[PDB]
Amino acid sequence: VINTLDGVADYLQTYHKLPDNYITKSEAQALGWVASKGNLADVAPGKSIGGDIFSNREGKLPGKSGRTWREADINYTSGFRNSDRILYSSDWLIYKTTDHYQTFTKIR
């Protein structure tokens, strides 16, 4: 039941992991998720995509040696994925994107 911006944001800083309703792109694919058919809720009820490495190809997120970035989807319930993500670092810095990793803003 945790897929809101604050909910997951608080959860990560604390429990240092994502809530149980999250699976990676690969777990989802193994379960039958086909991106082109927006069927995730049919193959993985109650789940949202989260936990894959975000490479930060365009250096938009603050780099540091030893630091890794991960993403999770936000406000997902069913259908095609939306454009909202939570970006979190190994050292628990939290950012949000609402435009498909174009622009980023700090939230914690």
From Swiss-Prot:
It is found in: Secreted. Its main location: secreted. GO terms for cellular component: extracellular region. The active site is at E71, H100. Its EC number is 3.1.27.-. Introduced by genetic manipulation and expressed in male sterile maize and rape by Plant Genetic Systems and in radicchio rosso by Bejo Zaden. Barnase expressed in transgenic plants will specifically destroy the tissue(s) where it is expressed. After cell transformation, protein expression and plant regeneration, the active nuclease destroys the pollen producing organs thus rendering the plant sterile. GO terms for molecular function: RNA binding; RNA endonuclease activity. Keywords: Endonuclease, Genetically modified food, Hydrolase, Nuclease, Secreted, Signal. It is an enzyme of class 3 (hydrolase). Belongs to the ribonuclease N1/T1 family. Hydrolyzes phosphodiester bonds in RNA, poly- and oligoribonucleotides resulting in 3'-nucleoside monophosphates via 2',3'-cyclophosphate intermediates. This is Ribonuclease. The chain holds residues 50 to 157 of 157 of the full protein.
